[PDB]
């Protein structure tokens, strides 16, 4: 259309300020899902999002949905449930099973996307949070790190409050160690109930430019247990 067709031979992107207003944030088309290109996209406030059979579409919406971790809304019923939680939460124990659980929920997460994000996980840039009921994976979430900003991709839940448990535990661990913001891309009723809000894209890009240079502790993303029953 009037979108920039990307090079199959370079990973540059047009500035997000140039995205379309309708559909909100559509910025470029094509390219590939190579690691360097995905990392360049996130670094600049862009993410791929397209349905099976579509060309790759890249986006940077205005406003941008974000979740300040200290503003996660946890209901009193959830507070009571978590006090007696039947779950164990871990980080980076089973990225493959987590993205698979999201995709089997997650129609935009095709085989190519799964492979692309698993590559990012192996390269140390994409991370999963797993929720277990004994030895059964019952929920989780994954995303891409950008310094002290975490870009949420998807989550899944196969047992009551499982995904909520992942987010609650992750937010506590993240904020306690220096994390500052979780990107949610677009607001919807679920994440809104969890406390997500909208900020102008300009402000989001400004937070990103500062935070991508920030660092969490050296071993913050090493596979480990975060919460036990």
Curated annotation (Swiss-Prot):
Its EC number is 2.3.2.6. Monomer. This is Leucyl/phenylalanyl-tRNA--protein transferase. Functions in the N-end rule pathway of protein degradation where it conjugates Leu, Phe and, less efficiently, Met from aminoacyl-tRNAs to the N-termini of proteins containing an N-terminal arginine or lysine. The lineage of its organism: Bacteria, Pseudomonadati, Pseudomonadota, Gammaproteobacteria, Enterobacterales. Belongs to the L/F-transferase family. It is found in: Cytoplasm. GO terms for biological process: protein catabolic process. One of its GO terms (molecular function) is aminoacyltransferase activity. It is an enzyme of class 2 (transferase). InterPro entries: Acyl_CoA_acyltransferase, Leu/Phe-tRNA_Trfase, Leu/Phe-tRNA_Trfase_C, Leu/Phe-tRNA_Trfase_N. The keyword Transferase applies. It catalyses: N-terminal L-lysyl-[protein] + L-leucyl-tRNA(Leu) = N-terminal L-leucyl-L-lysyl-[protein] + tRNA(Leu) + H(+); N-terminal L-arginyl-[protein] + L-leucyl-tRNA(Leu) = N-terminal L-leucyl-L-arginyl-[protein] + tRNA(Leu) + H(+); L-phenylalanyl-tRNA(Phe) + an N-terminal L-alpha-aminoacyl-[protein] = an N-terminal L-phenylalanyl-L-alpha-aminoacyl-[protein] + tRNA(Phe). PANTHER family: LEUCYL/PHENYLALANYL-TRNA--PROTEIN TRANSFERASE, LEUCYL_PHENYLALANYL-TRNA--PROTEIN TRANSFERASE. Pfam families: Leu_Phe_trans.
């Amino acid at each position: 259309m009037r979108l920039v067709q990307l090079s199959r031979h370079s990973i540059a992107f047009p500035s997000p300020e140039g995205a379309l207003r309708e559909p909100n944030g559509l910025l470029a088309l094509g390219g590939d899902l190579s690691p360097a290109r995905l990392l360049m996209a996130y670094q600049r406030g862009i993410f791929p999002w397209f349905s099976p059979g579509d060309p790759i579409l890249w986006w940077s919406p205005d406003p941008r949905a974000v979740l300040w971790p200290e503003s996660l809304h946890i209901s009193r019923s959830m507070k009571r449930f978590h006090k007696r939680s039947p779950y164990r939460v871990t980080m980076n124990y089973a990225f493959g099973q987590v993205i698979e659980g999201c995709a089997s929920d997650g129609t935009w997460i095709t085989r190519g996307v799964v492979e692309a994000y698993h590559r990012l996980h192996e390269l140390g840039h994409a991370h999963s949070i797993e929720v277990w009921r004994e030895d059964e994976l019952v929920g989780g979430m994954y995303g891409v790190a950008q310094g002290t900003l975490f870009c949420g991709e998807s989550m899944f839940s196969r047992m009551e409050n499982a995904s909520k448990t992942a987010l609650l535990v992750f937010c506590e661990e993240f904020i306690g160690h220096g994390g500052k913001l979780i990107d949610c891309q677009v607001l919807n009723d679920h994440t809104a109930s969890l406390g997500a809000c909208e900020i102008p894209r300009r402000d989001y890009l400004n937070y990103l430019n500062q935070m991508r240079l920030g660092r969490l502790p050296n071993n913050f993303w090493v596979p480990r247990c975060l919460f036990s029953p």
